[PDB]
Amino acid sequence: GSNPPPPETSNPNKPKRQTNQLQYLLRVVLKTLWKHQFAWPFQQPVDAVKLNLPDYYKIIKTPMDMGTIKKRLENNYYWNAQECIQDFNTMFTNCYIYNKPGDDIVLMAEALEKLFLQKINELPTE
Ligand SMILES: Cc1noc(C)c1-c1ccc2c(c1)O[C@H](CC1CC1)C(=O)N2
């Protein structure tokens, strides 16, 4: 039972907002990554129990996944786009820290991150 609670996707006191940038993040960035062939392992938290990776949450203390990001965006959890961008970067970084280069998961993260960076370059409010 080595899985933590997942990251919060709502919070009573944290102020909530919808900006054009946050709409772009849900409707274009998340949408393109979510439907990518390599999205699926990132669509929910890492299941250290199911994967038999009992040390995952010993090593990764700031977990993040796209399921979480998607719910945060749908819930207007974020105040600004930078918060969301930060979550995507945390997701990628965690994957690169925990796994070794040439692991399939790392190659999947690299392909998603390329696409992420391309979509982030067109972020509106321009
Ligand atoms: C994402 C992620 N970051 O570190 C690890 C470990 C994962 C991870 C998440 C889900 C799965 C996983 C790795 O292994 C396989 C998929 C990977 C082999 C590609 C699986 O079925 N689910």
For the chain, the distance separating the N- and C-terminal CA atoms, rounded to the nearest angstrom, is: 47
Q: Which two tokens stand for residue 75?
A: 């819930």
Among 44, 69, 105, 110, residue to substitute to test ligand 1 (most atoms within 8 Å of Cβ) = 105
Q: Which atom of ligand 1 is nearest to the CA of 108?
A: 19
- Residue 20 makes CB contacts below 8 A (sequence gap 6+) with 124, 125
Which residue type sits at 113?
E
How far is residue 52's CA from residue 68's CA, in Å, rounded to a whole number? 22
Q: Looking at the domain that runs over 19-123, which CATH code has it been given? A: 1.20.920.10
Resolution (A): 1.8
Q: How was this structure determined?
A: X-ray
Report yes or no: 111 and 36 within 8 Å, Cβ to Cβ.
yes
The amino acid occupying position 109 is A
CA distance 44 to 27: 19
Alpha carbon of residue 11 to chain centroid: 18
66 in Cβ contact with 43 (< 8 Å): yes
Cα separation, 108 vs 71, whole angstroms: 22
